């Protein structure tokens, strides 16, 4: 065979026996595929290695990334990396962002409440980072970190692209308050339709219930208003992640002139 | 509601039998509570619901039924487990005869925007494709490359909570859609990065069109960037950035909305 010499083939070298105590559960995680790959690594991510298998090209742009970030490289035998993904990196698990992170950033704050298909969590992490929301608040979503292998995934790799802070419903409404950022509820029936969100200058929180549920009461007191999308007819209700990207479409004038000065600053 | 205390009824043999064998080609079937009454309000006809002996049976269910002449029956919770085997439970559900499969000619009839999806495989951003089409006006659904083989299909079924029926949802290829699109003079545009026009200016066109979103693997194919009339970007904060696909089908319709809306109301 001759088989490159540079290919890890060994089931126990030291690095993949790693790879393994990752998977078996350092405050380190896996992050797969090129591009969440690369969401990471520009998010400011610190990798230990990027590994990819045996028989199939690397990304030029990722390969290069990791040339310019100082991020080792190395193949290991495909019939191995069946131990899962066709490239992949081991990372150091940032530390968890929190409340105050959100305020200081500027713009509008993505709550949600009840919210606990992780599918639908990590898609609405995608859609607020890529419309310039602040940040998002998860409460009650029964997640134990943001760094949860299904929600990577889920956000293709987004999670760490903004802060993403789990509270409780209670510092939630707090955090709101004490940073003077009203708060309106989206919900069917609402008063302000939601093509009028892009006219009130100043940022807000955006608080979206759950598929059943809707959100608590503790928000809905706190509230300065209900937001509503217009639908066929008012027995209806879109997916919480579609929700968002529509009320968030509505604020993106006002969010990337926000992202805007500050990549200026 | 009488009981199937147990044994085996015709009618829980049927409930086996609807599975992967010709039979499960004209009859179904659908799961939970909310499902059910979307399908039924959508005109589907259903043979006979059923609920588990145990937890007890939504009035707004049993009304409905009752209004139609849906026999309601309530089947030991012995029976209820196996039955749903390799997998998840339902302590609700209905067999109901399948409708007759939906066609381009009644998306074009119904009048309004027509949603393409091309190479959209992911059952769950179908199926809430599907409900968010409905929700906000389209006119219908042709799915393209979309690895199913029936829109009855039952994974579709689920993901779309019942849905799927509320509207036409048609599988086409790739051809015979654009062909279709071209010779009912329905101009369609392109979802996608760096294009010619903003989803802010979806609004500014009065007649319909049709909308082709691509998937995640690499946006929409040749062909129907050849029949395009154009194509609009959701604009974000950078062109690396991409949004899910049903989430920018949210932000598309949401946008051609007022339109779609008034077309729902006319006829
Ligand atoms: C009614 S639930 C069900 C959604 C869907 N079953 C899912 O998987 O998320 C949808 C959530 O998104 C928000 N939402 C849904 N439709 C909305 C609308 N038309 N206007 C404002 N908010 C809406 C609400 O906050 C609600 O809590
Ligand atoms: C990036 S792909 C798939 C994204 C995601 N992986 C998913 O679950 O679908 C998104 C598709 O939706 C439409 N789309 C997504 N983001 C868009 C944007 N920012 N502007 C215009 N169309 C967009 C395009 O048709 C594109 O081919």
Redesign the interface.
């Known amino acids: 065979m001759t088989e490159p010499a540079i290919i890890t083939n060994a089931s126990d070298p030291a690095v993949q026996r790693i790879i393994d105590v990752t998977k078996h559960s350092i405050k380190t995680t896996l992050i797969e595929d090129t591009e969440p790959l ?2 990471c690594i ?1 998010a400011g991510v610190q990798f230990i290695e990027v590994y990819g298998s045996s028989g199939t090209p690397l990304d030029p742009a990722l390969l290069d990334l990791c040339r310019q970030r100082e991020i080792p490289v190395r193949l290991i035998d495909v019939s191995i990396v069946n131990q899962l993904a066709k490239v992949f990196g081991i990372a150091r698990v940032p530390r968890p962002a929190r409340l105050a992170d959100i305020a200081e950033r500027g713009g509008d704050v993505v709550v949600l409440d009840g919210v606990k298909i992780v ?1 639908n969590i990590g ?1 609405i992490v ?2 607020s ?4 929301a602040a940040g998002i608040v998860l409460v009650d979503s029964d997640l134990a970190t943001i760094a949860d292998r299904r929600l990577l995934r889920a956000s293709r790799g987004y999670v760490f692209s903004l802060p993403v802070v789990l509270a409780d419903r209670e510092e939630a409404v707090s955090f709101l308050r004490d940073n003077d950022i009203a708060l309106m509820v989206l919900d069917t029936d609402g008063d302000l339709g ?1 093509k009028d969100l892009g006219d009130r200058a100043d940022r807000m929180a955006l608080v979206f219930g759950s598929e059943k549920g809707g959100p608590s009461g503790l928000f809905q007191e706190a509230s300065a208003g209900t937001v509503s ?5 008012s027995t ?4 919480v ?6 009320a968030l ?1 509505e604020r ?1 004038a006002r969010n ?1 002139a926000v ?1 805007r000065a500050a990549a200026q600053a």
């Open positions: 690369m969401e520009r599918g898609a995608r859609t980072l890529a419309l310039g939601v999308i217009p639908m066929l007819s209806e209700s879109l997916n992640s579609v929700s968002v990207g529509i479409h993106s990337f992202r």
